[PDB]
């Protein structure tokens, strides 16, 4: 039965399209069950709901999380982005003792077959629990046709270790659990061609040999700047908490939200709407930590940040003026219920609300803390002045001389960096209104005035010998002007009796 | 007023590649093709000032060396299967009254239009080559 | 639309009549991933049946339009909307592997 | 007919500033754009001196678009072409409608569903 | 001739081993050819260029009244004879341009990548002086290097739905 | 950059024949006759980017001397019943930064169109001809 | 190649008349006036390639004495009451390497076009008369 399948085969999408969190929308939610994130696991990437589910199950609360999240109709994938579910430790993870592993070099099955299939007889030494020398002398990889094969094939050779592949990594654990170290990255051994390098598991090649943990580890409890662990691993540039961050914590973590240049949001319920000192958001606004997003949900529905968030990440900043306000924006929760009075006090405190008008959501955002637009626009914009200096100094095969036409590059470079962003409606032209600058302020002024940014680089020989050799560019000082945003209307009808 | 130059040649940067090779002479030259504002005359004597859509677009001429990795680089955009798109910039930088300063001239959505005419001469050699790209909005500033 | 089911491999399946049928935006997808597989000159009932295979993967310099008839199949299916589809991998061997999108007349109820 | 029609249904029609092209297809360039008003007015001198006007019939306004379309076009500034809502259930005016037990209810699901599939098209269309 | 009926697990050894099949559809034929030696496409070709590489240097030195002179003029007279060679067979479908995957090149490893990604092929032919006074008076032309890279044919199809459940 | 020709004028092949003479002066000239890539402008802003199909024709013009082998050649191929094809390159040998390297000009598809203008002077005799050849396609590489 | 003429100006015949008294300088001017194949570019980017009826009709520009007998009889032509038909050529001998060659240019079926232009100066005579006659065919060999 030779199939009309081995000519054409139409199946369904399996892997997530398997990304990185490249672009600025790529969001997270931090749990604190240790359900299937444990340390070292610290975060998963997704671009469905149902994969979040799989991993989470539709009863737990985060999957409850990435469903309100994936519900905003133009959810943060639709503009390059991915959601990833962090993990803080909130109560004593039991780390469970594992077994010595051997990931061997990534190999591409198309060159390792190839390569394997003339090699007649076998040759290993591997150790397990640190036993006798163990040295395989005969292995036909001859008839072998995918690294499936081959895996079976190890896994019948090294006695007291299971073998196996998974993308194109092997993988080799040992049995037993605790000190079991695998000393042997697959050396040499006495006769028959070598295997052990052209797999790479061999010790000069990239294989990592993670010994056998001791046996069970407590990790302690930590607290919620533990997020630094997920931001050090994942670029994450929005995050929110499942748990309620605490009053005392929050300064920390909004401190942290402007350091790593990212937003992080965290929901409050109507006991904040104050003023006084006493009030954390309030803290947050006199502190000027305009990265830490705050918001209101009457009922305490933590939700309502994940759409937020799954609502502002979702600027594809590429094309023309898709900056996006907040205002009046489809969210994926129910709207709450406020007074007048109470709503007047979350615009004056800096808090956003997904209010009711009529069975039709309304999002007011405040101004008392810099406008979200502005904070998540500001960071998209040194996160891209970043990658295009960044993929300067990549590109080319030279070294980028420190000669001034060296500088002519990096500042034009600089400049095609803020001509998109003002092609991207984040900043438009206008008159400078601050009253400071870099250089000539009539030449600073003008440059605001009809380009909308302006990009001195200071010269060569205005920097120290120490900092010459030190082989760093001068300082590059930009400056732009945020886009003249509308969010109501005071329409004054003029009076003619 | 009393300027004094550096590099006689401005600098010159296409899709992060600044022109390190020019030829002698007219190096660079920055045309701007069509007129800025049209106006028109009416029978009883106003007149109507529009600015012309194309008051922007420019012919950058670049004057390269015969071989020069800049004309490498010109000629392998000239040879793209499909028209590559140059936006880049031509920087001076230059001292007036004594003050260092620096003239930018922005170069937007441009493609080469008139190919170099290639000559190899023996009397007298001209080993350039001219490729005149037409930038859709230049903006200088200082 | 319903169309009966077909399982894992794709064979038929009877029995469990009325519930062996796809019911919606599933019936598209299975009938454009069966559209797809329609060689043209096969149906003698219809000879222009879907795109032509044994005239498109037998010569050389054809994959502009395999991606035109693929996109002309599925487009041509009731209840589809738009595409977006593009080719992956660059014949890992030979066989090239396409990414077909398209969405179907749901989802689209906001 | 009235002259106070005029400005009142002249400015009907409000251009948004997302700038839709042939119906969307920004994605050309506009040579040249016309838009031809016509009148028919009948020619011979109207009857009466005193009243007899009204005589200015309407035309339908064509308008003529020639532009060039190129493998690529860089469009300079304009906002992007947002999907315009689905406001079909604003009015969607339920719980007037009788009780009817379950598999009575949800025969009524399946029939929805069954000819969903056939309508829905058109009704996006 | 008349197919003949497989398995499918012989029709993938066959397609791993590098046998060739003519397999029945239905009533109908279908030739499924391995890649596991060379696509006989990729080996007939390949011929194909050697031997007509061959015929038109063959048809250089034949043509001219003259002798091909040992002058740089005659490097650059058998070099282009060969690029046009080349470019026929780019022209006739075995050669396309695109990024030369080796790593391994003549010349100028930036001069040797571009003319391959731009033209499909390159013809770098050493100079004279860079040859033994033993192979100058031998009557050789010095060693001349081609490089081309095979046009990307299809095969099979692997489509992949998108799915949104 | 540096860079030091040999033999002056480029080394031009046509049908399996080098041109060994050519005159003085500007020998062999490469003009493309086209413009690169066509452009359009919009109303609202935009510009219509597109290469003309027209992109790589060129016209070769060859300085041979009035009446050696090369006008011979030539001359033959204007006189022939039926246009003839040309189909060479224009090779360059030249040195950059003291490195030995080729320049290579493909012409494709040509045939003679503008014939040469014959003079002969007697105080001043210009004992040239210009053959103008336009080739369908001429790609230059390094 | 190495080329030595003989009697400058190239022997011109015409009906059985050969032109013994040549102005100095452009005696004769032979320009091809329509170019030899026209060629047109499809979309899909082939090329037709078609030589024009035209492709051999040449101007011969005459430049004779004030007065000579080759100004009377080429006159003569001009003042005939019917256009007179010549039939020539031109026949250039030459030494090529040091070989005895002739080079011979066939003009068919030509008449005077533009007439000669008198000028009788005083600061600076122009004893000269310019006959342009317009042959159908010139095939030169050699």
Same mark, same amino acid.
């Given at each position: ?33 240790? @359900? ?14 149902? #994969? ?90 001859? @008839? ?26 092997? %993988? ?19 006769? @028959? ?29 930590? %607290? ?12 994450? %540039? ?56 705050? $918001? ?47 709503? #007047? ?18 999002? $007011? ?59 991207? @409606? ?29 990009? $001195? ?41 | ?142 | ?18 519930? =062996? ?30 795109? =032509? ?9 054809? !994959?502009?339009?395999?991606?035109? *008839? ?14 977006? !589809?593009? *080719? ?21 109820? *906001? | ?53 009204? &005589? ?29 809502? &689905? ?39």
């Amino acid at each position: 039965m030779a199939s009309i399948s081995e000519v054409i085969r139409v199946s369904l999408q399996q892997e997530g399209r398997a990304i990185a969190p490249d672009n600025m929308n790529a969001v997270g939610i931090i749990t604190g069950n240790q @359900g299937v994130l444990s340390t070292a696991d610290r975060y998963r990437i997704y671009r469905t709901a149902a #994969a979040v589910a799989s991993d989470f199950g539709a009863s737990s609360q985060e999957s409850a999380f990435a469903n309100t999240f994936f519900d905003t109709t133009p959810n943060p994938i639709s503009a390059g982005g991915v959601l990833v579910i962090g993990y803080w430790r909130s109560a004593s993870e039991t780390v469970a003792a594992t077994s010595a592993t051997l990931v061997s070099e990534q190999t591409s099955e198309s060159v390792l077959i190839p390569l394997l299939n003339a090699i007649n007889d076998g040759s290993f030494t591997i150790t397990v629990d640190g036993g006798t020398e163990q040295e395989v002398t005969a292995l036909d990889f001859t @008839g072998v046709s995918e690294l499936s094969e081959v895996a079976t094939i190890l896994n019948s050779a090294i006695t007291g270790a299971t073998v196996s592949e998974d993308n194109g990594y092997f %993988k080799v654990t040992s049995s037993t659990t605790g000190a079991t170290s695998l000393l042997s990255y697959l050396g040499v051994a006495t006769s @028959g061609t070598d295997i052990s390098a052209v797999l790479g598991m061999n010790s000069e090649s990239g294989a990592v040999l993670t010994q056998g943990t001791d046996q069970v580890v407590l990790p302690a409890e930590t %607290k919620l700047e533990g997020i630094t662990a997920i931001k050090s691993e994942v670029n994450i %540039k929005g995050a929110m908490f499942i748990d309620q961050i605490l009053d005392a914590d929050i300064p920390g973590i909004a401190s942290f939200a402007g350091a790593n240049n990212m937003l992080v949001y965290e929901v409050f319920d109507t006991g904040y709407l104050s003023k006084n000192v006493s009030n954390p958001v309030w803290a947050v606004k006199l502190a000027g930590q305009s990265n830490f997003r705050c $918001l209101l949900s009457k009922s305490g529905n933590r939700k309502f940040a994940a759409t937020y968030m799954a609502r502002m990440h979702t600027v594809l900043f590429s094309g023309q003026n898709t900056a996006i306000t907040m205002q009046l924006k489809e969210l994926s929760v129910t709207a709450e219920e406020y007074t007048d009075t109470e709503i #007047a006090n979350a615009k004056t405190v800096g808090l956003d609300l997904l209010t009711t008008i009529k069975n039709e959501q309304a999002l $007011l955002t405040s101004g008392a803390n810099d406008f979200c637009d502005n904070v998540y626009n500001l960071e998209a914009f040194r996160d891209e002045i970043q990658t295009n200096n960044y993929n300067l100094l990549k590109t080319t095969s030279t070294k980028i001389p420190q000669t001034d036409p060296g500088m002519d590059t990096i500042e034009d470079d600089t400049e095609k960096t803020c001509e998109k962003y003002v092609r991207n @409606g984040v900043f438009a032209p206008g008159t400078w209104t601050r009253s400071d600058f870099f250089g000539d302020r009539q030449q600073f002024v003008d440059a605001i005035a009809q380009k909308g940014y302006y990009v $001195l680089i200071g010269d060569l020989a205005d920097q120290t010998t120490a900092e010459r050799q030190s082989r760093v560019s001068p300082v590059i000082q930009i400056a732009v002007k945020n886009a003249g945003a509308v969010h109501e209307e005071d329409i004054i009808i003029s009076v003619n009796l | 007023s009393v300027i004094v130059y550096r590099n006689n040649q401005s600098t010159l940067t296409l899709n992060g590649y600044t022109f390190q090779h020019l030829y002698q002479g007219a190096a660079l030259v920055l045309t701007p093709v069509n007129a800025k504002t049209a106006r028109t005359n009416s029978i009883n004597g106003g007149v109507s000032i529009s600015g012309r859509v194309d008051g922007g677009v420019h012919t950058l001429a670049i004057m390269v060396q015969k071989h020069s990795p800049d004309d490498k680089f010109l000629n392998d955009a000239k040879n793209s299967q499909e028209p590559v798109v140059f936006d880049g910039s031509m920087k001076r930088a230059y001292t007036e009254s004594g003050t260092l300063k620096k003239a930018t001239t922005t170069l937007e959505t441009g493609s080469i239009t008139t190919q170099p005419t290639k000559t190899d001469n023996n009397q007298d050699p001209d080993d350039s080559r001219t490729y005149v790209i037409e930038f859709r909005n230049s903006v200088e500033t200082f | 639309m319903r169309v009966r089911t077909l399982d894992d491999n794709g064979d038929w399946t009877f029995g469990r009549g009325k519930a =062996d049928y796809i019911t919606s935006k599933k019936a598209i997808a299975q009938t454009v991933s069966t559209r797809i597989k329609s060689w043209a000159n096969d149906n003698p009932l219809a000879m222009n049946a879907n795109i =032509d295979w044994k005239d498109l993967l037998g010569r050389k310099g054809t !994959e502009d339009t395999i991606l035109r *008839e693929i996109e002309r199949v599925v487009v041509q299916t009731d209840g589809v909307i738009r595409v977006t !589809e593009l *080719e992956v991998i660059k014949t890992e061997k030979r066989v090239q592997s396409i990414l077909l999108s398209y969405d179907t007349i749901y989802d689209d109820s *906001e | 007919m009235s002259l106070v029609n005029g400005m009142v249904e002249s400015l009907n029609n409000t251009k948004s500033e997302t700038e839709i092209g042939i119906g969307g297809y920004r994605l050309f360039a506009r040579v040249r754009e016309t838009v031809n008003y016509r009148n028919i007015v009948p020619t011979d001198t109207l009857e009466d001196g005193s009243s007899s006007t009204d &005589d200015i019939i309407n035309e339908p306004i064509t308008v003529s678009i020639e532009g060039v379309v190129s493998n690529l076009f860089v469009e300079e500034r304009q906002y992007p072409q947002l999907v315009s809502r &689905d406001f079909s259930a604003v009015g969607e005016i339920t719980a007037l409608l009788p009780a009817k037990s379950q598999q009575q209810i949800q025969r009524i699901s399946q029939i929805d569903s069954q000819i969903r599939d056939a309508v829905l098209a058109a009704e996006r269309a």
